Subunit: 109 residues, 2 copies
């Protein structure tokens, strides 16, 4: 990670993020409805792909970043207005709009 | 890509903030380069700095401590026998990871 940080320090100079996954439970509470990141990058129109137990649910338009700098991924938009049972594995991948490559950014189970 | 690297880093560390934009400080006369400052350095280790000038290694020294604003200055006069560096020279600054003794380029003049 130290080598990665300093590669990035040379390349981009300035970087600040918080991608700590904050999982939102629904009602009933055994459902995972959302994941929220406290401080996302905003230089590109990043999108999120969701996989549930290894199955692609695909990509949906991104929620606007809030004033506090946070961004929410709502699994209800990916799953027909329902959240995901917490016994499942849930993966969120952030998509680079320049390449269409995606990178793991949140995993439940 | 940097994007790939950023999101790899983000998955590993979650939360990070730095600024290594080189801020060159000129001497007297001002065609001499005397210092470089980085606005927000990493504070997780006791990082030191290696300086090279036109291909000549001036070695590794600790810098001054991280300031209250989070910045850190490297003073070339300490490395270069008490004198700044004519700005026609190439000046390279490397951060040394004290855990591995690996070097990383972090500033280059010319």
């Amino acid at each position: 990670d130290t080598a990665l940080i300093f590669r990035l320090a040379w390349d981009v100079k300035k970087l600040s993020f918080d991608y700590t996954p904050n999982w939102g439970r629904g009602n009933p509470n055994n459902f995972i409805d959302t994941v929220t990141f406290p401080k996302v990058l905003t230089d590109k129109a990043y999108t999120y792909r969701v996989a549930v137990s290894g199955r692609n649910l695909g990509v949906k338009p991104s929620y606007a970043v809030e004033s506090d700098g946070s961004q929410k991924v709502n699994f209800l938009e990916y799953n027909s207005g329902y959240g995901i049972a917490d016994t499942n594995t849930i993966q969120v991948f952030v998509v680079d709009p320049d390449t269409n490559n995606d990178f793991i950014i949140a995993q439940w189970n």
